[PDB]
Amino acid sequence: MKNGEQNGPTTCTNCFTQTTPLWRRNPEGQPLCNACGLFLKLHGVVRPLSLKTDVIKKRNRNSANS
DNA sequence: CAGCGATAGAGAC
DNA sequence: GTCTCTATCGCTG
Ligand SMILES: [Zn+2]
């Protein structure tokens, strides 16, 4: 389609967040967003998802990213 | 050209 | 000053 816009709604099975810079996955084949896969895998233990937030701090960038 | 992993940085008190 | 949590970068095919 010429729309090219959104067509596949990915869902984080851990926090349902649809806003993320990189989609991660669990060694079990379950889809995760950014922090869920990075944080859960490194901790190996469940932790209050209460850390759920819709606001993410944006960091600086390189001179130019193609 | 795009996607991913690992490491390090920053913030608040 | 120290500690924790999260994101981006660089590299390869
Ligand atoms: Zn998530």
Side-chain angles (χ1 to χ4, degrees):
Chain A
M1 24 59 201
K2 55 181 83 64
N3 180 253
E5 211 184 89
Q6 180 179 5
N7 296 314
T10 300
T11 296
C12 195
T13 49
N14 284 5
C15 77
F16 302 98
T17 193
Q18 63 187 39
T19 304
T20 169
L22 172 56
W23 279 106
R24 301 280 183 166
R25 55 176 68 164
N26 193 284
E28 290 173 88
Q30 300 298 118
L32 298 180
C33 66
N34 46 94
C36 286
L38 291 166
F39 186 93
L40 185 72
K41 180 180 176 61
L42 293 175
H43 289 70
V45 290
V46 293
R47 191 179 224 314
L49 299 177
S50 85
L51 292 178
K52 170 55 163 58
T53 165
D54 290 338
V55 181
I56 297 169
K57 180 175 73 169
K58 289 180 297 95
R59 291 180 60 166
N60 287 320
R61 290 174 59 167
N62 61 359
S63 183
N65 183 34
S66 282

